[PDB]
């Protein structure tokens, strides 16, 4: 109520105006959108995301994104987007629908936001409120540590939580992040993650892994396995929560079964 929220109902689409573009690398962008007034906030609880929706080439396309801005930000929302260009991966000649749609927007164009959405909310100081499904009440579990597995753009739901914890000097939850990508080129938001690690090392552990690592590389190599789970996530005996977001293949065949191997109950594993 104090600051006016933009996402007043989840059943409503809000056309937000694109006000700024930023080329980060060849295929990664930051887009900024104007909230309805400069004193609005988004209205997005930690742990949840929004959907963009648009009519692209005659079809309705809906996709989830987690902003890198937060409810402290007045007047705007920022998204970091990986663009899947056509005519690039000869085996995905068409590219990605939504990300190329965003790449093509001009300053002034609008796009429809809706939310908040998602089964998990972070309540602070270790309190996670997790719905078994969209229609049931949340179960509330209090952890002292959170393990996090992210592939590609899956980092933006981790970062939102990481930040939410580090802002709060009274939040002593320890976050352990294992970040998987294809090539060093593809470590999205590396400077942000490393600045946070520089300041908050006692509450933030960070480790990468790469499918095709360069010759000078100090971190993991290959897919997520038993050993990386043991070495870079809190142990199952600490009763940690474990969060996952990334390409469905990695989550389903690389993460979940090995999490089961090591001993993390599936009740303490959550996929965004
Ligand atoms: C909780 C959550 C948060 C998310 N946060 C973000 C975020 O912050 N930023 C973000 O950018 N995305 C985010 N996403 C992902 C986003 O929802 C989309 O999956 C992504 O934008 C791709 O959508 P698209 O329509 O463009 O691609 P699609 O049309 O769905 O593309 C189909 C698929 O083909 C493959 N593909 C196509 N072209 C290429 C190519 N050139 N190279 C390689 N593979 C290719 C990719 O696997 C691609 O996803 C998030 C998803 C979830 C669930």
Author numbering: 4 to 275
Lines from the paper:
Ufmylation of CYB5R3 depends on the E3 components UFL1 and UFBP1 on the ER, and converts CYB5R3 into its inactive form. Ufmylated CYB5R3 is recognized by UFBP1 through the UFM1-interacting motif, which plays an important role in the further uyfmylation of CYB5R3.
CYB5R3 consists of an N-terminal long hydrophobic stretch sufficient to tightly anchor to the ER, and also FAD- and NADH-binding domains. CYB5R3 catalyzes the transfer of reducing equivalents from NADH to cytochrome b5, which then acts as an electron donor. We manually modeled an open conformation of CYB5R3 by changing the arrangement between NADH and FAD domains at the hinge region (Leu147) so that it gives a predicted AFM image similar to the experimental one. The distance between the two lobes of the simulated open conformation was 4.0–4.7 nm, consistent with the value of the 2nd peak of the histogram obtained from the HS-AFM experiment. Since Lys214, the conjugation site for UFM1, was positioned at the interface between the NADH and FAD domains, its ufmylation would bias the equilibrium between closed and open conformations toward the open one, leading to the destruction of the FAD-binding groove and thereby reducing the enzymatic activity of CYB5R3. Remarkably, while free purified CYB5R3 exhibited a brilliant yellow color, the conjugated form was clear. Since FAD emits yellow-green fluorescence, these results indicate that FAD is released from CYB5RC by UFM1 conjugation.
